[PDB]
Scaffold this motif. Structure first.
Motif, PDB file in Angstrom:
ATOM      1  N   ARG A   1       0.837  -1.190  -0.080  1.00  0.00           N
ATOM      2  CA  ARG A   1      -0.030   0.053  -0.091  1.00  0.00           C
ATOM      3  C   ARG A   1       1.048   1.218  -0.198  1.00  0.00           C
ATOM      4  NH1 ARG A   1      -2.509  -1.422   5.075  1.00  0.00           N
ATOM      5  NH2 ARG A   1      -4.214  -1.291   4.043  1.00  0.00           N
ATOM      6  N   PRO A   2       0.623   2.235  -1.033  1.00  0.00           N
ATOM      7  CA  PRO A   2       1.530   3.313  -1.057  1.00  0.00           C
ATOM      8  C   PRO A   2       1.259   4.299   0.117  1.00  0.00           C
ATOM      9  CG  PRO A   2       0.234   2.844  -3.201  1.00  0.00           C
ATOM     10  CD  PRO A   2      -0.442   2.154  -2.126  1.00  0.00           C
ATOM     11  N   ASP A   3       2.309   5.091   0.324  1.00  0.00           N
ATOM     12  CA  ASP A   3       2.182   5.813   1.307  1.00  0.00           C
ATOM     13  C   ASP A   3       1.501   6.917   1.489  1.00  0.00           C
ATOM     14  OD1 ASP A   3       6.018   6.402   1.978  1.00  0.00           O
ATOM     15  OD2 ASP A   3       4.434   4.958   2.677  1.00  0.00           O
ATOM     16  N   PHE A   4       0.756   7.271   0.370  1.00  0.00           N
ATOM     17  CA  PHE A   4      -0.117   8.496   0.043  1.00  0.00           C
ATOM     18  C   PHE A   4      -1.473   7.948   0.582  1.00  0.00           C
ATOM     19  CE2 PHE A   4      -0.706   6.266  -4.167  1.00  0.00           C
ATOM     20  CZ  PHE A   4      -2.335   6.268  -4.171  1.00  0.00           C
ATOM     21  N   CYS A   5      -1.836   6.679   0.821  1.00  0.00           N
ATOM     22  CA  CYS A   5      -2.888   6.140   1.510  1.00  0.00           C
ATOM     23  C   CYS A   5      -3.172   6.675   3.035  1.00  0.00           C
ATOM     24  CB  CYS A   5      -2.951   4.764   1.255  1.00  0.00           C
ATOM     25  SG  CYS A   5      -2.817   4.046  -0.310  1.00  0.00           S
ATOM     26  N   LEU A   6      -1.992   6.806   3.567  1.00  0.00           N
ATOM     27  CA  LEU A   6      -2.109   7.508   4.871  1.00  0.00           C
ATOM     28  C   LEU A   6      -2.387   8.994   5.092  1.00  0.00           C
ATOM     29  CD1 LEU A   6      -1.618   4.354   5.645  1.00  0.00           C
ATOM     30  CD2 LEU A   6      -0.172   5.187   7.465  1.00  0.00           C
ATOM     31  N   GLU A   7      -2.152   9.677   4.036  1.00  0.00           N
ATOM     32  CA  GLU A   7      -2.287  11.078   4.128  1.00  0.00           C
ATOM     33  C   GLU A   7      -3.614  11.425   4.130  1.00  0.00           C
ATOM     34  OE1 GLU A   7      -0.213  12.596   0.466  1.00  0.00           O
ATOM     35  OE2 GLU A   7       1.733  12.325   1.541  1.00  0.00           O
ATOM     36  N   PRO A   8      -4.180  12.675   5.126  1.00  0.00           N
ATOM     37  CA  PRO A   8      -5.413  12.929   5.221  1.00  0.00           C
ATOM     38  C   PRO A   8      -5.976  13.389   3.725  1.00  0.00           C
ATOM     39  CG  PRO A   8      -4.089  14.532   6.054  1.00  0.00           C
ATOM     40  CD  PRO A   8      -3.220  13.463   5.637  1.00  0.00           C
ATOM     41  N   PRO A   9      -7.323  13.407   3.526  1.00  0.00           N
ATOM     42  CA  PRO A   9      -8.099  13.974   2.185  1.00  0.00           C
ATOM     43  C   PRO A   9      -7.670  15.423   2.261  1.00  0.00           C
ATOM     44  CG  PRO A   9      -9.471  13.524   4.011  1.00  0.00           C
ATOM     45  CD  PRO A   9      -8.369  12.948   4.667  1.00  0.00           C
ATOM     46  N   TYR A  10      -7.832  15.920   0.955  1.00  0.00           N
ATOM     47  CA  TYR A  10      -7.753  17.138   0.663  1.00  0.00           C
ATOM     48  C   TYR A  10      -8.693  17.798  -0.145  1.00  0.00           C
ATOM     49  CZ  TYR A  10      -5.083  21.327  -1.308  1.00  0.00           C
ATOM     50  OH  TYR A  10      -4.873  22.586  -1.578  1.00  0.00           O
ATOM     51  N   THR A  11      -9.339  18.840   0.395  1.00  0.00           N
ATOM     52  CA  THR A  11     -10.707  19.528  -0.368  1.00  0.00           C
ATOM     53  C   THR A  11     -10.031  20.449  -1.376  1.00  0.00           C
ATOM     54  OG1 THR A  11     -12.166  19.341   1.417  1.00  0.00           O
ATOM     55  CG2 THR A  11     -12.572  21.025  -0.214  1.00  0.00           C
ATOM     56  N   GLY A  12      -8.881  21.338  -1.324  1.00  0.00           N
ATOM     57  CA  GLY A  12      -8.493  22.054  -2.551  1.00  0.00           C
ATOM     58  C   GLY A  12      -9.270  23.441  -2.516  1.00  0.00           C
ATOM     59  N   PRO A  13      -9.006  24.357  -3.266  1.00  0.00           N
ATOM     60  CA  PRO A  13      -9.131  25.645  -3.470  1.00  0.00           C
ATOM     61  C   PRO A  13     -10.684  26.045  -4.080  1.00  0.00           C
ATOM     62  CG  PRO A  13      -7.497  25.411  -4.555  1.00  0.00           C
ATOM     63  CD  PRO A  13      -7.725  24.203  -4.238  1.00  0.00           C
ATOM     64  N   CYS A  14     -11.126  24.995  -4.875  1.00  0.00           N
ATOM     65  CA  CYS A  14     -12.137  24.969  -5.830  1.00  0.00           C
ATOM     66  C   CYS A  14     -13.481  24.915  -5.113  1.00  0.00           C
ATOM     67  CB  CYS A  14     -12.129  24.120  -7.040  1.00  0.00           C
ATOM     68  SG  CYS A  14     -10.919  24.834  -8.258  1.00  0.00           S
ATOM     69  N   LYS A  15     -14.662  25.391  -5.832  1.00  0.00           N
ATOM     70  CA  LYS A  15     -15.890  25.409  -4.964  1.00  0.00           C
ATOM     71  C   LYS A  15     -16.897  24.500  -5.255  1.00  0.00           C
ATOM     72  CE  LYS A  15     -14.919  30.428  -4.765  1.00  0.00           C
ATOM     73  NZ  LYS A  15     -13.786  30.241  -5.826  1.00  0.00           N
ATOM     74  N   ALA A  16     -16.556  23.518  -6.056  1.00  0.00           N
ATOM     75  CA  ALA A  16     -17.778  22.411  -6.296  1.00  0.00           C
ATOM     76  C   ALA A  16     -17.805  21.535  -4.703  1.00  0.00           C
ATOM     77  CB  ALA A  16     -17.191  21.563  -7.326  1.00  0.00           C
ATOM     78  N   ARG A  17     -18.808  20.644  -4.831  1.00  0.00           N
ATOM     79  CA  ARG A  17     -19.000  19.676  -3.780  1.00  0.00           C
ATOM     80  C   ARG A  17     -19.105  18.186  -4.410  1.00  0.00           C
ATOM     81  NH1 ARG A  17     -20.143  22.870   0.807  1.00  0.00           N
ATOM     82  NH2 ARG A  17     -20.643  20.783   1.664  1.00  0.00           N
ATOM     83  N   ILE A  18     -17.853  17.837  -4.594  1.00  0.00           N
ATOM     84  CA  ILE A  18     -18.074  16.385  -5.386  1.00  0.00           C
ATOM     85  C   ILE A  18     -17.400  15.482  -4.071  1.00  0.00           C
ATOM     86  CG2 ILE A  18     -16.422  15.161  -7.109  1.00  0.00           C
ATOM     87  CD1 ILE A  18     -16.060  18.057  -8.551  1.00  0.00           C
ATOM     88  N   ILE A  19     -18.321  14.204  -4.061  1.00  0.00           N
ATOM     89  CA  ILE A  19     -18.362  13.419  -3.040  1.00  0.00           C
ATOM     90  C   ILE A  19     -17.079  12.364  -3.690  1.00  0.00           C
ATOM     91  CG2 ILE A  19     -19.229  11.424  -1.660  1.00  0.00           C
ATOM     92  CD1 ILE A  19     -19.976  14.649  -1.235  1.00  0.00           C
ATOM     93  N   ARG A  20     -15.926  12.341  -2.931  1.00  0.00           N
ATOM     94  CA  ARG A  20     -14.805  11.544  -3.254  1.00  0.00           C
ATOM     95  C   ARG A  20     -14.450  10.539  -2.283  1.00  0.00           C
ATOM     96  NH1 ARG A  20     -11.713  13.199  -7.967  1.00  0.00           N
ATOM     97  NH2 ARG A  20     -13.230  13.840  -9.445  1.00  0.00           N
ATOM     98  N   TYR A  21     -13.725   9.644  -2.438  1.00  0.00           N
ATOM     99  CA  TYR A  21     -13.371   8.364  -1.336  1.00  0.00           C
ATOM    100  C   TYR A  21     -12.058   8.658  -1.011  1.00  0.00           C
ATOM    101  CZ  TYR A  21     -17.860   6.207  -2.523  1.00  0.00           C
ATOM    102  OH  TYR A  21     -19.256   6.121  -2.506  1.00  0.00           O
ATOM    103  N   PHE A  22     -11.633   8.197   0.024  1.00  0.00           N
ATOM    104  CA  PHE A  22     -10.292   8.477   0.587  1.00  0.00           C
ATOM    105  C   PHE A  22     -10.101   7.109   1.725  1.00  0.00           C
ATOM    106  CE2 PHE A  22     -12.397  10.537   4.193  1.00  0.00           C
ATOM    107  CZ  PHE A  22     -11.422  10.222   5.221  1.00  0.00           C
TER     108      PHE A  22
END
Length: 56
Positions: A1-22
């Motif tokens: 399992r890649p290390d990136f799997c342990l990082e917290p999710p990142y919403t980012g600066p855009c304004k949509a409300r897209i449901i994504r999995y982490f």
């Protein structure tokens, strides 16, 4: 399992409300988060399956 799997999710600066999995390493499963539509980080998947097949 890649290390990136342990990082917290990142919403980012855009304004949509897209449901994504982490991957949530504490729970041991993929959960949802609100993604803004731009500048995604790697722990961001379009489905629970894609998330689990990568980080599970």
């Amino acid at each position: 399992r890649p290390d990136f799997c342990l990082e917290p999710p990142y919403t980012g600066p855009c304004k949509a409300r897209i449901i994504r999995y982490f991957y949530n390493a504490k729970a041991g499963l993929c959960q949802t988060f609100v993604y803004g539509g731009c500048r995604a980080k790697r722990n961001n998947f379009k489905s629970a399956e894609d998330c689990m097949r990568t980080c599970g």
